[PDB]
Amino acid sequence: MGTKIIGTGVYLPKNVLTNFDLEKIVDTSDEWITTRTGIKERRIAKEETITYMATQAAKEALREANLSPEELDLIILATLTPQKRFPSTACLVQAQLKAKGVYAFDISAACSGFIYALDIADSFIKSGKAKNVLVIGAEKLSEAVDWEDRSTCVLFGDGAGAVVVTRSEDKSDILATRMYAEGSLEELLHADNCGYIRMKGRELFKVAVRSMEEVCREVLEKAGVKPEEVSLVIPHQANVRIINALAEKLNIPKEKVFVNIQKYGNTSAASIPIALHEAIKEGKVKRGDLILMTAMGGGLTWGAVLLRY
Amino acid sequence: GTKIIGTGVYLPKNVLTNFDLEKIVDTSDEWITTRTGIKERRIAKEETITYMATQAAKEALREANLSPEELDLIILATLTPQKRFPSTACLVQAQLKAKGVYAFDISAACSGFIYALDIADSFIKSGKAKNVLVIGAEKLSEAVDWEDRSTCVLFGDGAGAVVVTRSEDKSDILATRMYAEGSLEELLHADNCGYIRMKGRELFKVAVRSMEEVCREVLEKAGVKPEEVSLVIPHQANVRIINALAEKLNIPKEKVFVNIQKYGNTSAASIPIALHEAIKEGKVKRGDLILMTAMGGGLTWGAVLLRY
């Protein structure tokens, strides 16, 4: 029984960019950024390409799963910064991993990319169409950031996260998932004619808390799980204040809410998978634990996934 | 099972004939026709990819007698997305007024539609979705090198869509098989500028072999012979490749549907557009076994065998 996570990995760019470094780039400050978001630093893929980052996170994940690339049945990569029009970055990565002939493609869902991709993987496993699936969330957001706009350039970072899921016969499994989208709210968060990230910060914040709360409550009810029974909440890392307001609305103690936005900023699709990896490595996740993942992103995509590790 | 209850398309009205092409590049009607089987293609002028996708979807929904808000998921396959984000699937969702509906784009170039249909099938089969809208839409005219005659005579613009649902009858996707091979990126890829580039002769050969193999694979999986297939709906890449495949599978041309002569190669939109026409022309009836297959950039390829 169950879609089970048997391996996780990540790749964090070599270049660190603190708020102090940014102060010299745009009219901003450490105090402002820190208090309004909780971000202290962010990684920048100045040297690495999206493909390279995704491949590294995937390799570590496969090593952890003790699974050969060829044993994969599917590779799903979520990103909003593809290497090229085509082939998909999933294909470029597959090539680097030597996962010959392996089914591969990218998906677009912005910040909701990983949970969308994980939900897809679960559909393939639950339909008996796949057994081993590699799900990657990789982003080189720095290429989509307007570095002259102190309003948005201080929120994003680069990096990649990956997880390997398989069909197990034990109790590990995804208990419930729920994804939503609302294209009529494109304006709140979207790319312009040149691909630059644009947003309506205030409106977005409201919608973010309300929407993630709603879908989180939905998966909990569907799974017949109460908030107090959640072992750990791994939310998209967009703003520490949003995360706090969300935890409050769900009545989940801060101690059970994983946060690492302070060191990576908002990495979109790679956000949750990177947090999951560190959470595991920090001894905060053990088999049997109920993990709640949730996110909201451009296009106004959002959802939640409740699983028993 | 997974049943197609509605289909639809959208094609720009602007026609790019081989004679128009003779006026922009050093090519001829004779060469094009003989080498590709193409005579005409549609080109989007005022339509955005979102508009075309929306029009194809609306027809599919009407055919299915289903309202936009009764959809559980929307999957759109394209290589010419409207913007960085939101996904074109989200933009289409807004135009359809399918409020709150799960939606995303996938990248698999020419195998876009069958990949998306395979995913749709996984959601219905796992019982996670009931009604799914799958779209193949491309405005390839924006990604073509018009200075290049070796490739600018092959592509057109268009959108195709299908609405699949979980039925309590024999309609169902019987078997699917999808593959990808990144090490073969060089045969068919976009350059640093997004322009479509390819190693035509090598891609032609690899295309037939891989497509024959995957087709044979879904057939032995479903327990049926090529002779038992009612209609083959291949990606409309090249009539000559289509003939080579049909020849290998030992399937008469009468059972191979082609409309590349009037729409050219429309990548992800290719199959759903051909399917819709085949249905409208009475070439597809409930119970018929339909084989869909394609190969595209990245070197994606696969096959879907279904009972209409």
Residue-range definition of the domain harbouring residue A292: 170-309
Nearby residues of B182 by Cβ (< 8 Å), 6 or more positions away: A87, A91, A92, A93, A94, A95, A96, A104, B298, B299
Contacts of B143 in chain A (CB under 8 A): 85
Contact flag B92-A122 (C-beta cutoff 8 Å): no
Q: Are residues B279 and B216 in the same domain?
A: yes
Instruction: Let me know if B272 is exposed, middle or buried by CB neighbors in 10 A (0-12, 13-18, 19+).
Output: buried
Q: Where are the alpha helices (DSSP H) in B23-87?
A: 29-36, 49-64
Assess whether the previous peptide bond of B86 is cis (omega < 30° from 0): yes
Q: Are residues B155 and B245 in the same domain?
A: no
Distance between CA atoms of residues A191 and B25, nearest Å? 35
Q: Are residues A3 and A142 in the same domain?
A: yes
> Looking at the partner chain, which of B125, B178, B183 has a beta carbon nearest the beta carbon of A95?
B183
A236 is catalytic: yes
Instruction: Let me know if A30 is exposed, middle or buried by CB neighbors in 10 A (0-12, 13-18, 19+).
Output: middle
Q: Determine contact: B85 vs chain A, CB below 8 A.
A: yes
Distance between CA atoms of residues B208 and A106, nearest Å? 25
Distance from the B6 Cα atom to the nearest Cα atom in chain A, whole angstroms: 23
> Residue A254: helix, strand or coil by DSSP?
helix
CATH number of residue A89's parent domain: 3.40.47.10
State the DSSP code for A156: B
Give the number of other CB atoms < 10 A from CB of residue B70.
15
Asked if residue A11 lies in contact with residue A1, where contact means CB atoms within 8 angstroms, the answer is no
Length in residues, chain A: 309
Q: Determine contact: A87 vs chain B, CB below 8 A.
A: yes
Domain boundary among A105, A140, A169: A169
Helix pair A89-97, A50-65: axis angle to 10 deg: 50
Contact flag A93-B182 (C-beta cutoff 8 Å): yes
Q: Phi, psi at residue B36, to the nearest 5°?
A: -130, -20
Q: Are residues A57 and A136 in the same domain?
A: yes
Q: Are residues B174 and B159 in the same domain?
A: no
Q: Of B165, B306, B166, whose CA–CA distance to B231 is shortest?
A: B306
**CB-side neighbour CA atoms (13 Å) of B180:** 37
Q: Where are the alpha helices (DSSP H) in A127-239?
A: 201-223
Nearest chain A residue (CA) to B72: A180
Q: Are residues B54 and B152 in the same domain?
A: yes
Catalytic residue among B18, B90, B110, B152: B110
B235 is catalytic: yes
Contacts of B88 in chain A (CB under 8 A): 108
> Residue A234: helix, strand or coil by DSSP?
strand
B 177-196 residues with CB < 8 A to A = 178-183, 185, 189-192, 194
Instruction: Let me know if A100 is exposed, middle or buried by CB neighbors in 10 A (0-12, 13-18, 19+).
Output: middle
- Distance, C-alpha B27 to centroid of its chain: 27
- For the record, the structure tokens of B263 come out as 């729409």
Q: Are residues A82 and A191 in the same domain?
A: no
Q: Of A96, A98, A92, A120, whose CA–CA distance to A108 is shortest?
A: A120
Q: Determine contact: A75 vs chain B, CB below 8 A.
A: yes
Domain boundary among B168, B200, B230: B168
Q: Are residues A64 and A75 in the same domain?
A: yes
Report the number of distinct structural domains present in chain A: 2
Q: Are residues A126 and A190 in the same domain?
A: no
Contact flag B106-A107 (C-beta cutoff 8 Å): yes
Resolution in A: 2.1
Asked if residue A51 lies in contact with residue A96, where contact means CB atoms within 8 angstroms, the answer is yes
Q: Are residues B4 and B124 in the same domain?
A: yes
Nearest chain B residue (CA) to A187: B86
Domain boundary among A169, A193, A215: A169
Asked if residue B135 lies in contact with residue B75, where contact means CB atoms within 8 angstroms, the answer is yes
Q: Are residues A200 and A130 in the same domain?
A: no
Strand partners, B307: B172, B289
Distance between CA atoms of residues A266 and A268, nearest Å? 6
Q: Are residues A177 and A216 in the same domain?
A: yes
Give the number of other CB atoms < 10 A from CB of residue A67.
17
